[PDB]
Design a binder for this molecule. Structure first.
Ligand SMILES: [Cl-]
Ligand SMILES: [Cl-]
Ligand SMILES: [Cl-]
Lengths: 286, 287, 287, 287, 290, 286
């Protein structure tokens, strides 16, 4: 029933498989994106594709097709599955080499496009915990690369699962707030909004869209380092990402954030963001 | 011609494939080992299997079979391919789940065993190494003690080495101490004494452990302690250790000749002793 | 019904009060100890008093009496309350001064001795622990070796543990190494060997020292070395040590079962040996 | 003569005492503020009270009264002592609980308000400062943004300054950036522009905020950014800000004259503007 | 043929020598500047002299003459050698003292001015662009040996240069003690991405006079500009990268750690800034002769 | 009339000058040693020469003569000046090159040997202060290299001069005790001695000799990281170096160390070290 684009063919999900000798599998040597289709439009497709190519560049991986070709493949995959509302996961792998680490011995990067249909926690808000693991360092495994190396994020998620949080919050190698395991973080205090610079986290496309809205609404905004203290004493906290959209965080490390309910500024941004997703995007069908 | 063990079946290499929905593929959420078979014996099989289970425990992954069963699967795979001299790569993945990162939605970890025939031009001359700008994954972020499918830190270091004229990359850690090579542990020889970093910022190498046993047996003064760039540059000899590499001499670091620029006497002695050990020890595949 | 020593007078608990202008209250500017009396003997009294004076020296606080006098005051306080089995908390404060933080304006340090009767369930099952996001106070900022009235770092860790389903919090330090629990030192048991962090990033525990003496006496291989999250997660056994806790097994860390998830054999052996030590050693309270 | 508010009653200073079993005393588990009354007005009372509640929130302490009630208690205490010019120190403690550090066993937080009369030589000449070896408490360990009873880090810095010939201590943070003085925020003036550290590694000073408002009103170029030792040493002018200090010029740092070694023109201008602000703003105590 | 100013006298290059007991030699205890003369004008002379005095202040060294006197000595040295296009290296040392490191035993700081003829034999020498590598050594810390001080302690820079020589780069790029991009071994670094320019704050590197001039041009041209921390990722994924310094002017970086930067050629924004900077150096400066 | 060896000639001190174009002067690009002659013997000459060559190797500088030749030049210089009790400062520079920092343009390293005669604070002990500047990092400008880059040490000394200490004590980039501005540090507590590992400081020749004495006397000894706390609460503290020998530290940051007088263990080591210097060394004359 659902087809996956895999190296020039459409393949049913149950048969969508990659060689175990692909370095993307052996070493997580590959890059991916997360993209949303709303009402027959692909939201910020070009921005996501730009980031995919940036991720590839960072790991010295040449994507064997052009950005225009990649965009067409994504639209084609959504068409083949007749989707209007979907989550899209393009993946590019290093390809097959030998059992060592050398990426120069790898031939034929795989191009994969997964599309899955998209059909309670946002009325109540999420509980978050700060994890003991620091975010992968920007001088070790830069988190700005959306790569198949996501075990740092998974360890944080495992901590959150064990420790009663819906979401994990990372600090970075220098003690600053970084992001959630799968999303950027914003703090609201006295009508002003702050978010960490992007060096220690990922340059979120949702984060960028939300900042555009914040500026359009004239809410005072600063991109600056934040600490545990700012999280705990915030009027409101929310996280942003493709899958999450804008998710309110109402408890952090057992402490109620403000009144413990999604805040007024968060709710306003949720509305404005919904509007943006309904009116922007590359059309799938004509 | 070569078969891979994949979840209870032997599958030809060309067909050995994993679902793209396995979290091992999507997120590198899985663990692996590198094991060597020499002359029909599997060198330190039990030690590698112990480490595999430790790696799995560190990432909260339950391996669905026992260690004894895992050892039997490895031996069976070597038998099916009629190998006596091989490299073995067991892999355990988190398994198929949804497209989020939550490992709770994953069911059925995959168990994979790759065996490839493994039959020293760079070892007579020694290797050139470069120190990389990327630090090793932190022991408080993505602990390098876990041999996981997250190897992009190692690959970035290797990319730097390829671009910068080194056969091998050397990492420093988040605190500025020498960690290891991109795929092996590092030892420094100075005035007849040997030092190696503690294992917290690198990986508890099985070769490293075997080499330390030899060092102690030979009565060479040995210390496990932090090392710096200075110690690398001014060493009498440097070598790296791992399953694939065995003992590889490093004769140039960052453009500087190490000692006389040839593999050193202590390194050569350890290479001989290690060869001897691989020829006389191990779990028999056939016998 | 209990008397507290307070600056030369014995005072009922309900009246044991300190001026709000004491810098020990305003700024946590003071030091303390935790000492145990077992069966009419005070366990390691001299070691605790030495550490109290070391803590005071570290914060440039002169304790206005001698160590011998301090020991006599402690024994007297236990006598006055007729205790044989107790927890003792000596406290020395900077003393009353002005509203600024300058300790030079403080005159007369207060000397306080609290003694409370000691009359487990969590020790048969073992404790659950979580690693906290807050790092331990740095050894170059507010050295954790000082047992001072500044315990908010420990309290924040405890608050995290309370919210996150742990009985105990485990700290990492400013450099990413394992430090200690919020109120106790940490030991890791792996393949019959024991490791514990060096004391620089934590506190030189008197229980920790006693336990190391036992470990050496029993010939269990022991190393004082840096430990990481990986070592915690993959340990055969983990336990914590302190005056109040004695030896407490840790059986779950961050949702991961430690070994079999029950107090381990080595831990149980050390618990027995430590019990024996407390029953046979100490400064007698009554003659 | 002077009364202290303590849990619903006015108590003479000499009798203002807290139980030694209060966690605010045992562990510095509590929060405080420093507020100034000028000419019958309380300067920035609401801002200080907001920060007090933020400090409490950061340490998960529930202040048992509302902010309005707290403001009334402060004004009442100033009235009872007939003060027009005073320093006010509200304190909230975790309260009496057990001898362990667990804050869940604490039940009734104490509310304390100290008011002391206020009544220049060092401000005409300026202060000498030294940079200390101790780093500021980390924003990921014991966040300095919390104005808590844990002030030993500040006291250690002050002890260093006392011993090393400075009127004031300057901290760097865990990452090597300038943080603040032991009891005040720091500003640097260079080529007519002013810089101050972001507030993450120090405290969000109410004086600092007021001074930034003045700076902006006067159109002096201003940047909140990280500063280093170099910026201190080569500054045209340096000054510190806090409730007690107001604006204090720093004219020597680590033996080096700052600019001409006298309070600078920009500093003097800000001192005048700040004086004006304190004379015309505030919550009236009486009228 | 070339004279060096040395403590009040002009001395031929071959005889320009300092006592081995000068702490400037023994311990690198001294400060220096790098200044350019273009077409009879000294570019940003006053800015360089201000930085020289700031460097001296940072190491608690009192320069025994005034800034005006120092400027006159520099112009005099250029005059004596009849230069119009030159590189100028003023140096101030702590002076002769005993063999311990205590600077209190030093008396009489030396003042040295070197001037060497400089200038392009070929206009487009940066037509292809430079290759760079990121080094393993971190930049001297701003809490250890602050890189803002242009001192005679340049071994950190030399180690990075040694790494670059061995590793196939024309230039070395440093990260700092906290993992952020700092600068090249002898120049400030700028990154261009989607028409916007970023550069590290100056705390972990040096407040470059070229960097300041380039920022003025960037602002005048209305290119979006931000001073903020940058990482390896930003270098690798940049549209363009360039470095700035007195000797280098504006040098395009077209390869970093084996990765082509954008199209692997000097970029449009870089080329535009190179032109604008050339114009600035042709029309500004303290006249040597006039 | 003291002579300095300079590239093959003995030159009077007042004329001992180096070209300002030598990179050793321009960039501190060179290495040095500090060696002591006692009663006609050069103490640990071979150890110092080994370290000099190690320093040179660390900065990729080829010393143009052999170690045996270097030792002869040192002895010759002491002979020419008729010294029996002296401080020797051999220096090797990168040499003259262009005005850039590239060491490849530098072709002829200078060899310099300074010898100066050596002829109250030890009875009373020294005051020390801990400095704000951290020691040059072992991953930036490794302090194990005894190079002409000594401004880190000088900044610490400037702090000590201004702050009332005879000596400055450094912490390292990771917060551990490193060393004094010109000497290694040892801490004595409950009859046991500790000293930092050598990675963050310099492998002192005096430090090595003192450790040999400590072992010979059977004093418990451990090489391990030390903190501010260990300094402040020590029974005794002392520093070691060629010029200082063994110097007691009796006050640190305003705190009396033990009783505020040189300790028993320190005094014992001072005696044992004196004995060692009187009975060991390469003879200058026959
Ligand atoms: Cl990392
Ligand atoms: Cl801290
Ligand atoms: Cl450094």
């Amino acid at each position: 029933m659902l087809y996956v684009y895999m190296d020039g063919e459409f393949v049913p999900e149950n048969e969508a498989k990659v060689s175990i000798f692909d370095h993307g599998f052996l070493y997580g040597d590959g890059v991916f994106e997360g993209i949303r289709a709303y009402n027959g439009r692909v939201f910020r497709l070009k921005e996501h594709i730009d980031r995919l190519y940036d991720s590839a560049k960072a790991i010295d991986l040449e994507i064997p097709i052009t950005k225009e070709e990649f965009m067409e493949i994504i639209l084609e995959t959504l068409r083949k599955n007749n989707l209007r509302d979907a989550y899209i996961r393009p993946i590019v792998t290093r390809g097959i080499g030998d059992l060592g680490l050398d990426p120069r011995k790898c031939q034929n990067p795989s191009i994969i496009v997964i599309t899955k249909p998209w059909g309670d926690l946002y009325e109540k808000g999420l509980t978050a915990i700060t994890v003991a693991v620091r975010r992968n360092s920007f001088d070790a495994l830069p988190p700005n690369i959306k790569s198949l190396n996501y075990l740092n994020n998974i360890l944080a998620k495992i901590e959150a699962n064990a420790k009663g949080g819906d979401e994990a919050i990372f600090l970075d190698r220098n003690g600053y707030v970084s992001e959630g395991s799968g999303d950027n973080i914003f703090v609201v205090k006295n009508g002003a909004i702050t978010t960490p610079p992007t060096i220690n986290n990922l340059r979120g496309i949702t984060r960028e869209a939300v900042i555009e809205i914040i500026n359009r609404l004239g809410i005072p905004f600063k991109e600056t380092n934040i600490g545990l203290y700012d999280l705990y004493t915030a009027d409101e906290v929310f996280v942003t990402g493709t899958a999450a959209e804008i998710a309110p965080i109402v408890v952090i490390d057992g402490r109620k954030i403000g009144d413990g309910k999604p805040g007024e500024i968060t709710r306003k941004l949720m509305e404005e963001f919904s509007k943006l997703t309904e009116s922007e995007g590359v059309p799938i069908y004509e």
